[PDB]
Amino acid sequence: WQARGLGTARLQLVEFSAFVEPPDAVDSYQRHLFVHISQPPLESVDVRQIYDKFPEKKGGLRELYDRGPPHAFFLVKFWADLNWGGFYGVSSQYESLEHMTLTCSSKVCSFGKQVVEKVETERAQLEDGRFVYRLLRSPMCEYLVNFLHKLRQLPERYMMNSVLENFTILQVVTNRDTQELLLCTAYVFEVSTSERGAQHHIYRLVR
Ligand SMILES: *C(#N)N1[C]C2=C([C]1)C([N]C1=[C][C]=[C][C]=C1C(F)(F)F)=[C][C]=[C]2
């Protein structure tokens, strides 16, 4: 009844990735993954500790968690892989058993204040009775492409993790019709070393 992974019984993440394809992939294809989730109870982290890193007026982590449901709420810590005029992409995929029309907002936040939001819709495809929600190869919003290139040219990774300590993403998934929450995901970030590639730990947010 406790989650084993990033999802409810109602809506679950199949896959998420932010990536870059260099322009020479048109000949000899090759992708770089900044972060990547591909899909034993998860460890929990108290949500009140993480209020700092997200805004607190509306669509902030307090008021959504007050609004619930609590089991839809997750924290992901990413270790971003930051070594690599190509294409910059985000691909996300969810799965259900209801036929819903999803709305996915992504709040990019800085010192816990919203800087960019992207709000997409996806209706389901029926595949194996299981219903499938594909938001694939979405262009990365230019704030975060430019953030990456600024970030990557820092001379020390403690400077990078100093920056990313004040950098968060809140991703909010709702049924478009019923206006009810399905899955809300806070993201906190570090830079992994060069030898490491991308990695993640997934938590429940409890209160
Ligand atoms: C813009 N458009 N977006 C929407 C959106 C983005 C960027 C992310 N970005 C993300 C997630 C994890 C690690 C790195 C990044 C990025 F793109 F480099 F900032 C996630 C969700 C939605």
3-state secondary structure the chain: CCCCCCECCCCEEEEEEEEEECHHHHCCCCCEEEEEEECCCCCEEEHHHHHHHCCCCCCCHHHHHHHCCHHHEEEEEEEECCCCCCEEEEEEEEEECCCCEEEEEEEEEECCCEEEEEEEEEECEECCCCEEEEEEEEECCHHHHHHHHHHHCCCCHHHHHHHHCCEEEEEEEEECCCCCEEEEEEEEEEECCCCCCCEEEEEEEEC
| Nearest-atom index, ligand 1, CA of 35 | 13
Solved using: X-ray
All domains of the chain, ordered by start, with CATH? 11-205 (2.70.50.80)
Nearest CA to ligand 1 atom 9: 18
CA of 24 to the centre of ligand 1 (A): 23
Angle at CA 38, nearest 5°, toward 34 and 42? 105
CA of 90 to the centre of ligand 1 (A): 7
- For ligand 1, whether the C-beta of 192 sits within 6 Å is no
- For ligand 1, whether the C-beta of 169 sits within 6 Å is yes
Please classify residue 44 by burial: count the beta carbons closer than 10 Å to its beta carbon, then call 0-12 exposed, 13-18 middle and 19+ buried: middle
CA of 32 to the centre of ligand 1 (A): 14
* Cα–Cα distance for residue pair 144/204, rounded to 1 Å: 26
Provide the sign of the torsion angle of the four alpha carbons 129, 130, 131, 137, taken in this order: negative
Sheet containing 101-110: order of strands: 44-46, 199-206, 73-80, 181-191, 167-175, 101-110, 114-123
Nearest CA to ligand 1 atom 11: 18
Resolution expressed in Å: 2.3
- For ligand 1, whether the C-beta of 173 sits within 6 Å is no
* Maximum distance among all Cα pairs of the chain, rounded to whole angstroms: 51
Strand partners of residue 89: 19, 139
> Residue 25 in contact with residue 84, Cβ under 8 Å?
no
* Cα–Cα distance for residue pair 101/131, rounded to 1 Å: 11
* Cα–Cα distance for residue pair 47/36, rounded to 1 Å: 23
> Residue 116 in contact with residue 32, Cβ under 8 Å?
no
User: Among 60, 34, 35, which Cα is nearest to 47's?
Assistant: 60
> Residue 183 in contact with residue 72, Cβ under 8 Å?
yes
